[PDB]
């Protein structure tokens, strides 16, 4: 079904840091005007972060930046995009159908979560077609895996509609996700904040509300990021069919067990956090 992608200028990714990103609500309990000390897997302040960005500008140096990343006791994912290039993630130990794997993907309208022994191919991507006659986009070429199997867990949301282009320059989405696998439960925390930064991860504090706790009950050691490419009138052939991606950036960080002091607002929203291990001043504050 799916095929490998050729003609990609392969350059290793950039490195960034998370100034205060990756803080999430520990529990659904409501607390107001109080400072609470909690120990949980957390993203350490100013932790090393890997920056994978898709620039397909004319003149060469085009890249897709789609590698396999290890899942180390949970991961922090931040995506800055205006074209919705990021579509989802695949989580599995081997990803070759020998073991069950988790697929989370938004084809175009509704997010679909499936746990099945999937035969994921080397290049798991999604496809879009730009018609010049009637300026429209059908989002075709859905090719993440080659085969399914048992499918122990199925989750499908109701259908919606989405913009498949929206290229105006600076990224405006800044979607942030935290993934944790504990006691056979996959926990996702999601925060969306509008941003105007042209090409860099913003330095800010965000609190990620709990989204879902899927009972996948599977072992996860590795993950990949699914991406969408658009092919129109350039160099057709299905391996290098002018699959230019206008612009997208994604950042990967690793959760570590840490002790954090969380400040609760009068309205009960976390507004500030302190990482005790980060520096001596933070250690005294804790």
């Amino acid at each position: 079904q799916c095929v490998n992608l050729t003609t990609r200028t392969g350059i290793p990714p950039g490195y960034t840091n998370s100034s205060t990103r990756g803080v999430y609500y520990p529990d659904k309990v409501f607390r107001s005007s109080i400072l609470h000390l909690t120990q949980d897997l957390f993203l350490p302040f100013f932790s090393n972060v890997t920056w994978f960005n898709t620039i397909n500008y004319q003149g060469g140096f085009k890249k897709f930046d789609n590698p396999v990343l290890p899942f180390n006791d949970g991961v922090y994912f931040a995506s800055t995009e205006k074209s919705n290039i990021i579509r989802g993630w695949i989580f599995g130990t081997t990803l070759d159908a020998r073991t069950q794997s988790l697929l989370i993907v938004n084809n175009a309208t509704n997010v679909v979560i499936k746990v099945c022994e999937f035969q994921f191919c080397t290049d798991p991507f999604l496809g879009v077609y730009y018609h010049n006659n009637n300026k429209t986009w059908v989002e075709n070429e859905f090719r993440v895996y080659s085969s399914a199997n048992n499918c122990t867990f199925e989750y499908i949301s109701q259908p919606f509609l989405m913009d498949l282009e929206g290229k105006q320059g600076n990224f405006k989405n800044l979607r942030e996700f935290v993934f944790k696998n504990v006691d056979g439960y996959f926990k996702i925390y999601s925060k969306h904040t509008p941003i105007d930064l042209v090409r860099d991860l913003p330095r800010g504090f965000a609190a990620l509300e709990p989204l879902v706790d899927l009972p996948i009950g599977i072992n996860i050691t590795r993950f990949q990021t699914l991406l969408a490419l658009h092919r129109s009138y350039l160099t057709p052939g299905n391996l290098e069919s002018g699959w230019t991606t206008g612009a997208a950036a994604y950042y990967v960080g690793y959760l570590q067990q840490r002790t954090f002091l969380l400040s609760y607002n009068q309205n009960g929203t976390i507004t500030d956090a302190v990482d005790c291990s980060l520096d001596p001043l933070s250690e005294t504050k804790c």
Partner: protein, 299 residues
């Protein structure tokens, strides 16, 4: 207070010795449909232990009285909560796990237990809240020829993590020689078929086990015990039962608003300062009925 018949002249601050609450109120959400006990327990077929089946239960009334005539349970154990209090409590996240094991492997289905089922088939978290239910299923799970449909994983590289299911059929090589499939001298197929028979001993007889895992007070609860709701009483000291939380306090409207994920609020002391009414999404502040402060000045 002085523990003496005679009292001298003094301010004598005194401890309260009077009764205040006489009204008890129960607030539970509106649930009409009964829990699907018949699907969960009375099922034509049950999953194999290695591929244990997990079913989400929500929007149900948990009345276990209905099962009393229909089913008899050999083993009933609740770790998180006392069995008598189940009727008065609401369960936020109840999941039912169904599988078939040998009669003497029922003991293995407990937190901290070890054995073939615990190590490579089904694992329970040490901090487990919920009830484990087991009953003999020889009539439905045993055939005169023999039932070999049920399977268990005899060999695995490592012990399973809690609530982890593996259905891999990859050949296991005990010996150093790579197996490359082709089961041989030191290579063995991991799954082993059970051999249930009608005339077989009770230890070898098939047992159906259902494990219920749930959290009670924390989180919104769509599953509740069979207690009728009563009209809300406010501005009076009353005993209250909101979603299985029982306390004595004065109920008042609360300015503070919880976020949609949040269901209840706790103060610095960790007592439940604010609660949300189950039927109507109105935040109610909880205030201690007594304010204290009494002294008896006596000659």
């Amino acid at each position: 207070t002085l523990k003496s018949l005679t009292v001298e002249k003094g301010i004598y601050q005194t401890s309260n010795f009077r009764v205040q609450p006489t009204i008890s109120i129960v607030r539970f959400p509106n649930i009409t449909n009964l829990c699907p006990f018949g699907e969960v327990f009375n099922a034509s077929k049950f999953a194999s232990v290695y591929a244990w089946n997990r079913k989400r239960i929500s929007n149900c009334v948990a009345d276990y009285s209905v099962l009393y005539n229909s089913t008899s349970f050999s083993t009933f154990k609740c770790y998180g909560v006392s069995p008598t209090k189940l009727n008065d409590l609401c369960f936020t996240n109840v999941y039912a796990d169904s599988f078939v094991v040998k009669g003497d492997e029922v003991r293995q289905i407990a937190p901290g237990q070890t054995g073939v089922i615990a190590d490579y088939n089904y694992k329970l978290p040490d901090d487990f809240t919920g009830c484990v239910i087991a009953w003999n299923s020889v009539k439905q799970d045993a055939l005169t020829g023999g039932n070999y449909g049920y399977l268990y994983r005899l060999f695995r590289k490592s012990k399973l993590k809690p609530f982890e299911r593996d259905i891999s059929t990859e050949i296991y090589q005990a010996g150093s020689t790579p197996c490359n499939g082709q089961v041989g001298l030191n290579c063995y197929y991991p799954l082993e078929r059970y051999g249930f028979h009608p005339t077989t001993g009770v230890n070898y007889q098939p047992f159906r086990v259902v494990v219920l895992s749930f959290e009670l007070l924390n989180g919104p609860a769509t599953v509740c015990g069979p207690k009728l709701s009563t009209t809300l009483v406010k501005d009076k000291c009353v005993n209250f039962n909101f979603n299985g939380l029982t306390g004595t306090g004065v109920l008042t409207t609360s300015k503070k608003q919880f976020l949609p994920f949040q269901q209840f609020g706790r103060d610095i002391s960790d007592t439940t300062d604010a609660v949300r009414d189950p039927q109507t999404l109105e935040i109610l502040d909880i205030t201690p009925c007594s304010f204290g402060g009494v002294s008896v000045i006596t000659p």
